[PDB]
Design a protein around this ligand. Sequence first.
Ligand SMILES: CCCCCCCCCCCCCCCCCC(=O)OC[C@H](COP(=O)(O)OC[C@H](N)C(=O)O)OC(=O)CCCCCCCCCCCCCCCCC
Ligand SMILES: CCCCCCCCCCC(=O)O[C@H](COC(=O)CCCCC)COP(=O)(O)OCCN
Ligand SMILES: *[C@@H]1O[C@H](CO)[C@@H](O[C@@H]2O[C@H](CO)[C@@H](O)[C@H](O)[C@H]2NC(C)=O)[C@H](O)[C@H]1NC(C)=O
Lengths: 50, 56
Amino acid sequence: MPLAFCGTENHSAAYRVDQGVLNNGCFVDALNVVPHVFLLFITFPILFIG
Amino acid sequence: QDVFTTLVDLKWPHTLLIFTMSFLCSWLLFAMVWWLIAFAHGDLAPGEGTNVPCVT
Ligand SMILES: CCCCCCCCCCCCCCCCCC(=O)OC[C@H](COP(=O)(O)OC[C@H](N)C(=O)O)OC(=O)CCCCCCCCCCCCCCCCC
Ligand SMILES: CCCCCCCCCCC(=O)O[C@H](COC(=O)CCCCC)COP(=O)(O)OCCN
Ligand SMILES: *[C@@H]1O[C@H](CO)[C@@H](O[C@@H]2O[C@H](CO)[C@@H](O)[C@H](O)[C@H]2NC(C)=O)[C@H](O)[C@H]1NC(C)=O
């Protein structure tokens, strides 16, 4: 029982991307993590210099 | 604005932190890219490899 970003239930069938990726209730959640890791990794070097 | 002068002026322990962060962030920024590309492609699903994975 490892850590699964999406639902690990139903034999880990939440990663299926039929009927468009945007209709995957977990992939849209994944798309919302990139804008934050982008800034968290662009500014950390900049702030650490300061 | 004098970033490359500033980086040299910093003490060595600070330089190690910036050296580490500049590479850890780069590795992890593209870690989200590879994870998401393989998510969108659909080869992340734990099933029989009917397709050809985007990155094996
Ligand atoms: C108000 C309080 C402010 C406090 C500010 C200071 C904060 C210090 C943080 C303390 C922890 C730092 C640990 C560093 C360990 C290596 C450095 C070390 O042992 O010292 C050796 C020195 C640094 O000494 P210094 O007197 O500060 O040098 C300043 C320099 N003379 C200058 O002013 O110009 O360095 C050298 O002589 C450079 C040789 C480098 C070669 C070693 C390779 C190590 C690479 C990194 C390895 C670790 C990787 C970890 C990755 C983790 C990932 C999860
Ligand atoms: C730059 C570094 C790499 C970034 C990571 C790779 C991105 C993959 C996700 C693709 C995607 O964002 O999804 C596509 C739809 O995106 C858009 O219309 C744009 C708006 C949404 C994005 C802001 C796929 O559409 P689809 O028709 O459902 O595709 C499969 C069904 N035919
Ligand atoms: C879980 O994945 C499987 C396969 O996609 C599906 O589960 C069964 O689907 C059939 C469809 O004919 C149903 O009759 C069963 O009742 C389902 N069983 C379970 C335990 O779900 C379904 O797509 C997914 N189900 C859920 C709840 O996620």
